[PDB]
């Protein structure tokens, strides 16, 4: 495996994660997933910034009971190929984010309006509660696997994420599962995996940025995120049709 320097000690890196994470997790939780000596699944270190051939029909068959993602081997491989990323990684990441194809935004929402976010509506009280809406000419089903655009809800605006997530998906033309899988591939490719700025081209790097100054740019906040996706990948790993697996592992300064 290639070696990517993290430039601080393992201890200091864990502490940096813990203090900067918007949620609170324990040192020991972080240590267990950050320490590469404790990894039991090497697929979190797989270089995923290249397409690898897979058995498409085998993948479709394996995606047996996966909600909206059921049997969608072709759409996954097509998206992976178009974006030069690993299709098993993409499958796994989508299965995770959508709860095996069952999340509301992933399953398809058939909408009749979208938000104009440039026209917010506030409480007499200073709180955001709505936007001016735009009525669609006819109902349109939109899909959004990762909830891109789906910003935070509040007590006085409980459906903000649903409204903005479906709006974004409409505005990006994610009106079929095939397009939404392409949109997902594009998101991770351009922002993480094939970013020349960020170079976050393994699952572990996506979660745990190798540049300490860039630790705000990380895909998720759960300590176990990269491990979780790798475990899903392992369920599909026999479907590869090639053998050119290269790995990249973190190196800490003590």
CB 161 within 8 A of CB 152: yes
What residues have CB less than 8 Å from 172, skipping those under 6 apart? 183
In this structure, the strands spanning 2-5 and 248-251 are: parallel
Using only the alpha carbons of the chain, give its radius of gyration. 20
DSSP of 194-246: T-TTT---SHHHHHS-SSGGGTT--S-S-TTHHHHHHHHHHTTGGGBS-----
User: What technique determined this structure?
Assistant: X-ray
Alpha carbons 136 and 144: distance in angstroms, whole number:
18
What single-letter DSSP state applies at residue 37?
Answer: G
Query: Into how many domains does the chain fold?
Result: 1
Alpha carbons 14 and 148: distance in angstroms, whole number:
28
From residue 225, alpha-carbon distances to 95, 105, 191 in Å are 13, 20, 17
- Provide the domain limits for residue 20: 1-254
The CA angle 238-242-244, to the nearest 5 degrees, is 110
Q: For the chain, what's the residue count?
A: 254
Alpha carbons 59 and 77: distance in angstroms, whole number:
9
Resolution in A: 1.8
Alpha carbons 183 and 153: distance in angstroms, whole number:
23
Alpha carbons 106 and 116: distance in angstroms, whole number:
22
Alpha carbons 240 and 2: distance in angstroms, whole number:
22
> Long-range CB contacts (< 8 A, 24+ apart) of 154-163?
154/127, 154/128, 156/123, 156/125, 156/127, 156/128, 156/129, 157/127, 157/128, 157/129, 157/130, 160/128, 162/104, 162/105, 162/109, 163/115, 163/131
């Amino acid at each position: 495996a290639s070696k990517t320097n993290y430039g601080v000690s393992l201890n200091e890196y864990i502490k940096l994660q813990q203090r900067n994470n918007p949620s609170n997790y324990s040192y020991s939780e972080f240590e267990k997933y950050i320490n590469p000596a404790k990894a039991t699944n090497k697929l979190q270190f797989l270089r995923i910034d290249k397409f690898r051939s897979v058995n498409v029909s085998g993948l479709s068959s394996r995606l047996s009971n996966k909600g909206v993602l059921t049997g969608q081997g072709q759409a996954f491989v097509n998206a992976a190929k178009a974006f030069n990323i690993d299709p098993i990684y993409l499958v796994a990441q989508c299965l995770h984010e959508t709860g095996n194809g069952t999340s509301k935004l992933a399953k398809g929402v058939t909408i009749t309006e979208i938000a104009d976010e440039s026209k917010p509506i506030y409480n007499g009280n200073g709180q955001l509660v709505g936007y001016h809406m735009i009525k669609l000419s006819k109902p349109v089903t939109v899909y959004n696997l990762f909830g891109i655009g789906a910003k935070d809800n509040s007590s006085v605006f409980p459906n903000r994420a649903l409204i903005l997530g479906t709006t974004y998906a409409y505005n990006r033309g994610w009106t079929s599962i095939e397009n939404a899988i392409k949109g997902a591939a594009e998101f991770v490719s351009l922002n993480y995996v094939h970013s020349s700025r960020y170079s976050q081209n393994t699952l572990y790097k996506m979660r745990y940025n190798q540049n300490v100054s860039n630790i705000w740019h990380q895909y998720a906040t759960t300590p176990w995120y990269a491990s979780s996706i790798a475990d899903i990948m392992r369920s599909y790993q026999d479907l590869y049709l090639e053998n050119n697996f290269t790995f990249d592992v973190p190196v800490f300064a003590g």
